[PDB]
């Protein structure tokens, strides 16, 4: 189901997304969520994210609940508040959302351990897209990445399910992308979602 760049729907070009505010651009019922980011102990700003419920409803709803606190295990909420970005590769992507262990091992979703790939409709055609991290087919969980360049070699292996909105969002993404990392691409100073929610 993969669309070529010439076939893309309105509202998801880089220019269109950078004009976005707090309301969705691809489909009017798409939720918009946010992360406030701290780099070390410094508030770095806010990333606003449209979740493409119209194209990837299960992936969007999983991410959305992790932003709002609506997913509970035995009455205890769990989600992205306090989650880190544990793997940062300049000119490629920033990876985070492992609220389980903070190291890439976390594989919990609102559906259980892992959930299937939805249709691979959108390509990784530009920076600023949200896509699911996984360990092969049908192993989506809680982790995600934000593209920092086109990464079309990931097409049909990772579901692109959202986009950042507005220029500040991309400024924060670029700041995260350029922090110092160790030999394993782990940041030397933590990058944390200190607050998150739905707009």
């Amino acid at each position: 189901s993969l669309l070529s760049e010439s076939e893309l729907p309105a509202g998801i070009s880089y220019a269109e997304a950078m004009e976005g505010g707090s309301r969705p651009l691809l489909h009017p019922d798409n939720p918009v969520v946010f992360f406030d980011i701290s780099i070390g102990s410094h508030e770095a700003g806010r990333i606003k994210i449209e979740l493409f419920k119209n194209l990837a409803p299960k992936s969007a709803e999983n991410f959305r609940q992790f932003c709002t606190g609506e997913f509970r295990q035995n009455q205890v909420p769990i989600g992205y508040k306090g989650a880190t970005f544990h793997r940062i590769i300049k000119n490629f992507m920033i990876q985070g959302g492992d609220f389980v262990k903070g190291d890439g091992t976390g594989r919990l979703s609102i559906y259980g351990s892992s959930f299937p790939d939805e249709a691979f409709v959108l390509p990784h055609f530009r920076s600023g897209l949200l896509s699911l991290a996984n360990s092969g087919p049908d192993t989506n969980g809680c982790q995600f990445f934000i593209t920092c360049a086109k990464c079309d070699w990931l097409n049909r292996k990772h579901v692109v399910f959202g986009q950042v909105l507005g220029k500040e969002s991309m400024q924060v993404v670029r700041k995260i992308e350029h922090v110092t990392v160790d030999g394993g691409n782990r940041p030397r100073i933590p990058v944390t979602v200190t607050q998150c929610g739905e707009l």
């Binding site: 793997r87 990876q95 890439g104 091992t105 594989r107 996984n134 360990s135 192993t139």
Partner: peptide, 11 residues
């Protein structure tokens, strides 16, 4: 390489 996995990170 440039993959985004959860568990065995590769080059």
């Amino acid at each position: 390489x440039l993959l985004v996995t959860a568990x065995x990170v590769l080059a």
